[PDB]
Ligand SMILES: *[C@@H]1O[C@H](CO)[C@@H](O)[C@H](O)[C@H]1NC(C)=O
């Protein structure tokens with residue numbers, strides 16, 4: 362759970378797993394505008 | 401097919417009636433005007449974002 366300097370982001374293994382697990386299936390609106398940008 | 405759509409029910413693609421090419425539609429860039437000021441009691445210069 363501690364961050365490591367071997368990765369560009371100041372996260373850990375458990376933190377990156379959380380970000381890569383919660384996503385959207387392109388069935389909404391945030392991915393079209395929020396995450397990149399095309400309005 | 402002639403022109404495209406998406407889940408948003410907006411036109412983002414079309415066929416050119418002149419030549420057989422596929423063109424995408426992206427709306428004109430826009431946004432809100434935000435004015436940053438330190439307060440009229442201090443200065444007059446402002447920053448626009
Ligand atoms: C913003 O404009 C620059 C022009 O120098 C371009 O290189 C860049 O790709 C543009 N950013 C976009 C389209 O997100």
Ligand SMILES: *[C@@H]1O[C@H](CO)[C@@H](O)[C@H](O)[C@H]1NC(C)=O
Nearest residue numbers: 437438439440441442443444
């Ligand atoms: C703010 O405005 C008042 C007048 O309403 C003035 O007396 C004061 O000097 C100004 N500046 C401050 C409170 O730093």
